[PDB]
Amino acid sequence: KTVVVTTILESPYVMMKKNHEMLEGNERYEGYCVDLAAEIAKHCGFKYKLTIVGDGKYGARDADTKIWNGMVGELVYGKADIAIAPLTITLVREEVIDFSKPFMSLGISIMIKKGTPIESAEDLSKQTEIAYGTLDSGSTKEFFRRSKIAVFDKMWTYMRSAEPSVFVRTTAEGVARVRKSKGKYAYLLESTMNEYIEQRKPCDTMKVGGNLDSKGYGIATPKGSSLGNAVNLAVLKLNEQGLLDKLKNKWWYDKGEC
Ligand SMILES: C=C(C)[C@H]1CN[C@H](C(=O)O)[C@H]1CC(=O)O
């Protein structure tokens, strides 16, 4: 059967082509993960249909409801066959679905407006005049919650209680708030999105310091899937031959504006 790929709109992973209105099917999307899906399909020998995740979410389990949302939920409930998106490999997700080896390696990072006296996470926690927060939900937020490393455990302590919520709802909202915040707000996000935005006009932001942790993005399939082993060997083949790094330069640095 034809494989149903769940993915999500987020630059430069997946975006609607300009002429999307006059296009159909897989031809109406473009991006790192669209390019990646085509490669994975060619290597594993399958025809597929790219679909944008119903709820625009990635994957989390509602507390008492115990229902999984997002792309992971589409995999878990059988609404999708494979998830090709910037979906962070985490324990809670790997408990319910399968992840391939990373196709991309990243880590949480700090994004500041050009000119901020913050050069590190320590610099951040040790003060308070400079605001700093994460996405309202996602893997970065859970990193600070499930945390007990001196600075990170202390950083979380500070965030939850912050006055204006310091938490944002989207990536574009954290960037918009760092730029409209005129120096006061620092956004904590994944290095990948950070590297991408550091290459967009007005070229007024920048990644600072090293990453807080070492993670990866993986292609997910429902636990015990026939496709699992194939996609996993596909990712390793793509990495080894260097195509993964070419695809990143393409979507991140070839068209760099700064
Ligand atoms: C863009 C979003 C909401 C995603 C992308 N990977 C992370 C994930 O899969 O949880 C989330 C970002 C973050 O939490 O910093």
Task: Render the burial of 236-258: b for 16+ CB within 10 Å, e for the rest.
Answer: eebbeeeebeebbeebbeeeeee
Q: Please state whether the peptide bond connecting residue 86 to the residue before it is cis, i.e. omega within 30 degrees of 0.
A: no
Q: How far apart are CA 105 and CA 200, in angstroms?
A: 21
Taking the CA of residue 251 as centre, how many other CA atoms within 13 Å lie in the half-sphere pointing to its CB? 20
Tell me, yes or no, if the two domains 1-106+216-255 and 107-215 fold the same way: yes
Domain 1-106+216-255 coded CATH 3.40.50.1000: no
- Give yes or no for residue 87 CB within 6 A of ligand 1: yes
What does CATH list as the number for 107-215?
3.40.190.10
Q: Which of 219, 207, 213 is nearest to 94 (CA)?
A: 219
What are the start-end ranges of the E strands in the chain?
3-7, 15-16, 29-30, 48-52, 82-83, 97-99, 104-106, 108-113, 131-133, 185-190, 205-208, 215-217, 220-222
Report the residue count for the chain: 258
Residue 169: CB atoms within 10 A of its CB come to: 11
- Give yes or no for residue 189 CB within 6 A of ligand 1: yes
Partners of 3 in beta bridges: 48
Helices (H), 3-138: 32-44, 70-76, 91-94, 121-125
The alpha carbon of 140 and the centre of ligand 1 are apart by a number of angstroms equal to: 7
> In the chain, after which residues is the C-to-N distance over 2.5 Å, breaking the chain?
none
Q: How far apart are CA 178 and CA 172, in angstroms?
A: 10
Experimental technique of record: X-ray
Domain coordinates of the chain in residue numbers? 1-106+216-255, 107-215
The alpha carbon of 218 and the centre of ligand 1 are apart by a number of angstroms equal to: 12
Q: How far apart are CA 20 and CA 16, in angstroms?
A: 6
Binding-site residue numbers are 86, 88, 93, 139-140, 190
Residue 9 near residue 52 (C-beta atoms within 8 A): yes
